[PDB]
Amino acid sequence: NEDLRLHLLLNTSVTCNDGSPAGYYLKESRGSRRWLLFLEGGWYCFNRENCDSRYDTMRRLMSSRDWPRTRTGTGILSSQPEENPYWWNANMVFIPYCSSDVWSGASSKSEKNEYAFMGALIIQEVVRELLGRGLSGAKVLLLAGSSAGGTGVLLNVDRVAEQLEKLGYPAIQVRGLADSGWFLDNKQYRHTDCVDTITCAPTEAIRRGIRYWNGVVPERCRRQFQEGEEWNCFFGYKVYPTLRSPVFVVQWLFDEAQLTVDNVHPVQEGLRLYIQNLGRELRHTLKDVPASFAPACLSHEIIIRSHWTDVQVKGTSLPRALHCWDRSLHGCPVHLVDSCPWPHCNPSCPT
């Protein structure tokens, strides 16, 4: 009874990679006008061979066929006030990641093509369906997501805001929370052939991906870059400046996924400097992001983990930082970035 319940999209042309219906999990809180829509992450695949291995080995991320009927909300999706001090009573939605496209895909596939990439269409579908189940009464819609879902937020939040403005819902304030989705298009520590998904350099992964997924990026970002250079917009620091919606960025200064795509594994001095500098460059990209939480840890994702309340930056927890931000949009710091130079120089890093 306390769990989020699955609904498969009515529009059966909007699908996961394998053509099974996409969907969303929902727990209504009928006395609340706040809505949390969470986009799941889990990498991506950018060519046929790699999508084949992902289908063999990680079918969950390509198909709805085995999704369970319900799932328990955790972290910012929990309905327990101890676990979720300020958002426990919100309406909760979890949108599973079954498009492998960083939530960017916007075409119905060709029959010639074998996988469908419909991440951007899923989100809009889910939003439309929600309108008939309570979202029509919302005042705040926080679009949140972790890892590829955090990148998804940056790519989709202004489109959700535009969609709701266009459909006649001017009172719904659309906001984003991007967790572990803020990446650097940097040079790898040691350069790889781009042969597996997880070790392909981040610039090349998106360059290929965007073409393979027929991915879309926010128009205001696309305009800033030359034709063919849309890949730039998958990078938080490049897409953020033109976002109209308020967006709170949560980012570990040493994200495990960043180190993975940078082909990084007492460390030798070259490797020490590359790591320190990675932390430094990330810190620098967050300088002009007033609402951010960036601890000096090597970790990945946080907002739906049960222990998300434990990490602190300058004495402030993440749920508290987020509450300060909420209050500012409706003494309470919202800009919280570690300055220490090595992973786990913050005592409160998760394990």
Ligand X SMILES: O=S(=O)(O)OC[C@H]1O[C@@](COS(=O)(=O)O)(O[C@H]2O[C@H](COS(=O)(=O)O)[C@@H](OS(=O)(=O)O)[C@H](OS(=O)(=O)O)[C@H]2OS(=O)(=O)O)[C@@H](OS(=O)(=O)O)[C@@H]1OS(=O)(=O)O
Ligand Y SMILES: *[C@@H]1O[C@H](CO)[C@@H](O)[C@H](O)[C@H]1NC(C)=O
Among 9, 90, 126, 143, binds ligand X (CB under 6 A): 90
Closest CA to 37 of 147, 163, 178: 178
**36: β partners:** 92, 142
- Residue among 101, 185, 255, 326 flagged as catalytic: 255
How far apart CA 283 and CA 287 sit, in angstroms, is 6
Is 288 part of the annotated catalytic residue set? Answer: no
Among 326, 335, 343, 346, binds ligand X (CB under 6 A): 326
The stretch among 7-15, 28-36, 184-192, 222-230 that binds ligand Y (CB under 6 A) is 7-15
CB of 169 to ligand X, least distance (A): 14
Among 5, 13, 314, 339, binds ligand Y (CB under 6 A): 13
Is 196 part of the annotated catalytic residue set? Answer: no
116 binds, among ligand Y, ligand X, none (CB under 5 to 8 A by kind): none
The stretch among 6-14, 76-84, 198-206, 244-252 that binds ligand Y (CB under 6 A) is 6-14
144 binds, among ligand Y, ligand X, none (CB under 5 to 8 A by kind): none
CB of 167 to ligand Y, least distance (A): 13
Interface map 151-190 toward ligand Y (x if CB under 6 A): ----------------------------------------
Q: How many residues bind ligand Y (CB under 6 A)?
A: 5
Let me know: does 91 contact 33? Beta carbons within 8 Å: no
CB of 32 to ligand X, least distance (A): 3
- Residue among 147, 180, 292, 299 flagged as catalytic: 147
326 binds, among ligand Y, ligand X, none (CB under 5 to 8 A by kind): ligand X
Residues whose CB falls within 8 Å of the CB of residue 172, separated by 6 or more in sequence, listed in order: 135, 138, 139, 140, 141, 164
Interface map 93-112 toward ligand Y (x if CB under 6 A): ---------------x----
Q: How many residues bind ligand X (CB under 6 A)?
A: 11
Integer angstrom CA distances of residue 249 from 108, 190, 286, 318, 349: 31, 28, 8, 11, 17
How far apart CA 127 and CA 256 sit, in angstroms, is 31
According to the binding rule CB under 6 A, does residue 4 interact with ligand Y? Answer: no
The stretch among 28-36, 74-82, 159-167, 331-339 that binds ligand X (CB under 6 A) is 28-36
How far apart CA 121 and CA 159 sit, in angstroms, is 11
How far apart CA 344 and CA 340 sit, in angstroms, is 9
Q: Can you count the helices (H) and strands (E) in the chain?
A: 9, 14
| Total residue count of the chain as it appears in this document | 351
Is 7 part of the annotated catalytic residue set? Answer: no
CB of 323 to ligand X, least distance (A): 6
Closest CA to 45 of 70, 16, 67, 68: 16
Closest CA to 307 of 75, 82, 40: 75
Let me know: does 344 contact 298? Beta carbons within 8 Å: yes
Interface map 123-152 toward ligand X (x if CB under 6 A): ----------------xx------------
How far apart CA 70 and CA 77 sit, in angstroms, is 13
Sheet arrangement for strand 34-39: 70-71, 4-8, 23-27, 91-95, 34-39, 140-146, 173-179, 247-250, 292-294, 335-337
According to the binding rule CB under 6 A, does residue 81 interact with ligand X? Answer: no
Q: What is the DSSP letter of 77?
A: G
For ligand Y, the binding residues (CB under 6 A) are: 11, 13-14, 108, 121
Would you name the residues annotated as active-site residues? Answer: 147, 255, 300
For ligand X, the binding residues (CB under 6 A) are: 32-34, 89-90, 139-140, 323, 326-327, 330
